Structures are given as structure tokens and as C-alpha cells.
């Protein structure tokens, strides 16, 4: 069902949270070889999550589930906010700009935390 597909998407999101916190520890310790690998891992994870979310939204639309569509349109928009911040973080890493990396890291955390009440609302709506 769309609901079990959302639970699968939610687990993929939690994997990115796990790899993100590990990466943050690695960055603070200056283990840039680890950070590079974790950033690659996170990129693939976000690509997957983004695809799952789009499929879920498209299915909610085909099902005429207006409330779930509204919530998923709001949540996907905020996902792109997180994604653009991630990508700028990756660029800051490539450039050796640790001040920007730190800024982007904290922002991506606040964007993610903010978008959690919505994420729980979608689970219930599908």
C-alpha cells in the first residue's frame, strides 16, 4: 500500500539521519576521508528518498487523497529546501570552506527538525 511505501521511505530517511550524524562527528574530528565517503552515501540516500516521496505523492494524487496530496506537496517542497542546503554543503567541502560547511550543517539540521511534524502527519493521512 501507499502507507507501507511511506514507511519504507521513512526508514530510508532515518538511515540518512544516522549517516548524517556520523558524518558530523567525522567533520568535527577532521577525518575528511570519512566525510567524503559519508557525503557520497548521503547523496545516494537522498536520491532514493526523493524518488520514493515522488512516487508516494503521485499515488496519493491518483487515489484522490486530497489531504495527503496537500501535505505531501508541502513536505516535498521542504525536502528540496533540505536538498539545496545539502548540495551547497557538498560544494563547501570540495572547496575546503569549513565555515560554510558548518553553517550549512546546522541549517540542514534545523530544516530537518522543522519538517518532522509534517512527516508524522503524512503517515496518518495516507
Ligand X SMILES: Nc1cccc(Oc2ccccn2)c1
Cell numbers that stand for 108 in this block = 540542514
Taking every pair of Cα atoms in the chain, the longest distance, rounded to a whole number of angstroms, is 49
**Which of 25, 118 has the CB closer to ligand X?**
118
| Rounded CA separation 37/27 (Å) | 11
Measured distance CA(82)–CA(66) in Å, rounded: 24
Residue nearest to ligand X (CB): 82
Q: Which residue has the cell 519504507?
A: 8
Considering only the stretches 24-32, 55-63, 76-84, 95-103, report the one whose residues sit in contact with ligand X under the rule CB under 6 A: 76-84
Q: How far is the CB of 69 from ligand X (least distance, A)?
A: 17
> What is the smallest separation between the CB atom of 17 and ligand X, expressed in angstroms?
9
Long-range CB contacts for residues 102-105, cutoff 8 Å, separation at least 24: 105/24, 105/27
68 forms part of the interface with ligand X (CB under 6 A)? no
Among 6, 86, 93, 101, binds ligand X (CB under 6 A): 86
User: Does 57 participate in binding ligand X (rule CB under 6 A)?
Assistant: no
Of 82, 93, 101, 105, the one binding ligand X by CB under 6 A: 82
CA distance 22 to 26: 6
**Binding residues for ligand X (CB under 6 A):** 13, 46, 50, 78-79, 82-83, 86, 108, 111-112, 115
Amino acid at each position: 500500500s501507499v502507507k507501507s511505501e511511506y514507511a519504507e521511505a521513512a526508514a530510508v530517511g532515518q538511515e540518512a539521519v544516522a549517516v548524517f550524524n556520523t558524518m558530523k562527528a567525522a567533520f568535527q574530528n577532521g577525518d575528511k576521508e570519512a566525510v567524503a565517503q559519508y557525503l557520497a552515501r548521503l547523496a545516494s540516500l537522498y536520491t532514493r528518498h526523493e524518488e520514493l516521496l515522488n512516487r508516494i505523492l503521485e499515488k496519493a494524487r491518483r487515489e484522490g487523497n486530497k489531504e495527503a496530496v496537500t501535505l505531501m506537496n508541502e513536505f516535498t517542497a521542504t525536502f528540496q529546501t533540505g536538498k539545496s542546503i545539502f548540495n551547497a554543503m557538498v560544494a563547501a567541502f570540495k572547496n575546503g570552506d569549513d565555515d560554510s560547511f558548518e553553517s550549512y550543517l546546522q541549517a540542514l539540521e534545523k530544516v530537518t527538525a522543522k519538517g518532522e511534524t509534517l512527516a508524522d502527519q503524512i503517515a496518518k493521512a495516507l
